Amino acid sequence: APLPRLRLTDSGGKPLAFGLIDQPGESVELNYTCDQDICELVVHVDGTDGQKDSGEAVYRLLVGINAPNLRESGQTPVGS
Amino acid sequence: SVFLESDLVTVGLAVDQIVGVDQRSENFSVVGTLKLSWHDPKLGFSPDQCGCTVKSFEDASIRAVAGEINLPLPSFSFYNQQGNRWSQNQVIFVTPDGRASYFERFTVTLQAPDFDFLAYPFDRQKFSIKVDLAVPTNMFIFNEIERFQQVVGDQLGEEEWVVTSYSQEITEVPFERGSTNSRFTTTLLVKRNLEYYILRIFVPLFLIISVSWVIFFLKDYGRQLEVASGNLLVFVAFNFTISGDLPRLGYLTVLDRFMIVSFCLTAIVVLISVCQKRLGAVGKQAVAAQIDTWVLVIYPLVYSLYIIWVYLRFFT
Amino acid sequence: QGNRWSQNQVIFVTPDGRASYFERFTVTLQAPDFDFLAYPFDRQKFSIKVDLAVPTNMFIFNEIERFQQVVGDQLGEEEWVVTSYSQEITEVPFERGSTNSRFTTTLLVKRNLEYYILRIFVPLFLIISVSWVIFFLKDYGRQLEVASGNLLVFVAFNFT
């Protein structure tokens, strides 16, 4: 399946970060840090580059908080 | 633009099911869906004061929301509404840019003073649904028509009324305190089920008329008189049996006139039979045979001429 | 009688002080003066009375305005046909003395005569003629049989 676009926005839609394509271009990654007292985030994943009906493209999403080792987690999903 | 511009409203309506027609009070009831959309920058807000992208109002009419938020909104009403209107899924939601939309599912009864049942059961009617804005045209005006669904929906099973065609139009009509208000009209053209009436009424009536007609081949006039007397009673029995499908409107239709003519001819048959019986009693059988031939020749011609006259006077 | 249904009810005023009221209504009214003794050849009067709820020293009807036709035309036939109409302003006794204004609209109506005539009287005449004609016969058994059948035919038509 083709690589989709990734971006991070708050609950109001204000953009905060955008995805970066790695040199081994098989995945897209994102990073952000919290500055305000309370931050509510929304993660956007879309593949609407054009109007092609590709069909049943399926992707895996990995997300973590205070977990910079998401590249090689090892452990099964922990915490809440 | 130096001058202020009227706000543009997009409207659309769909009909789901016709649930009843009252032929004496001249009204019908319908179930459907209505949708409105307009753009107003005065309704815009900032996301950071609520942490949301959509602000919504539920279970409230447009007038109530306008009174609560103290801003002008495009209220509407049904022109020929009779009694209260049942509403479901009523919601108004607004985007930060100022785009607003209205949704409603309704069940309403509408007056139809234009009904005409003169040609019953071959009559064709018009079902008109009118939506009028309750504001002058200088504030809000209908601009576009949106087709969110099929205007006329299909349902399983047969229907008493069959829709042949439909149309939608936007016009302007005079408004109270002068000025003008927009009107959105949906018109449905309908007709009845002809096979039901034909097979249920006309074939048995034709058979009864044929029974009354065929008895003139007999030369024993007592049997002819007895069969005519019985067939008149059979005709009356069939007439009241089908009286259930005979609407009481206070004025005559085609079916009533046809029944009256058939009854009159059936009674004249008995009268002629009595006259022929007396003539045969006196000894003038030749005149009776001549009368038999005359009746056999004349009766279908009279029926055909009456049918032609009715067609000329009611269908052209 | 009962509640009244109203549509497009609005009151609007101008800075000079000129105000007007508008309403579209559907109402049911009692008519104790009905008389159906001469049915179906009876004639009836439909009276609509509007009474002010204030004494005549505060408000009073002064003029009659014909903004539209008093009786409107509609497509198709009607059970009741209006022959004439009239409008008048009068004064009637009011509670706690004084007087209140009244505006009355009267409609004269009649039924559709051709319907009743053609649907009832001609078949009845034919049945009576059938009962009358049998006396020319000199075979009295046939006359008795036809009379017995015609009585049942008459009963059948009557309940029909």
Numbering used by the authors:
A (entry chain C): 242 to 321
B (entry chain D): 322 to 637
C (entry chain E): 403 to 562
Authors' own words:
To date, the only pLGIC in which an NTD has been partially characterized is DeCLIC, derived from a symbiotic sulfate-reducing deltaproteobacterium related to Desulfofustis glycolicus. The DeCLIC NTD accounts for roughly half the total receptor mass, and appears to accelerate activation and deactivation of the channel. Like several pLGICs, DeCLIC has been shown to be inhibited by calcium ions (Ca2+), mediated at least in part by a calcium-binding site at the ECD-TMD interface.
We then collected data in the absence of calcium, ensured by adding 10 mM ethylenediaminetetraacetic acid (EDTA) to the nanodisc-reconstituted sample. In order to identify potentially asymmetric conformations, we initially processed the resulting dataset without imposing symmetry, and identified two classes. The NTD density, albeit weak, enabled assignment of 87 % of NTD residues. Aside from the absence of ion-like densities in Sites 1, 2, 3, and 4, the sym calcium-free conformation was largely superimposable with the calcium-bound structure. Whereas no major changes were observed in the ECD-TMD regions in simulations with or without calcium, the NTD exhibited more flexibility, particularly upon calcium depletion. Similarly, NTD2 lobes deviated up to 7 Å with calcium, but up to 15 Å without calcium.
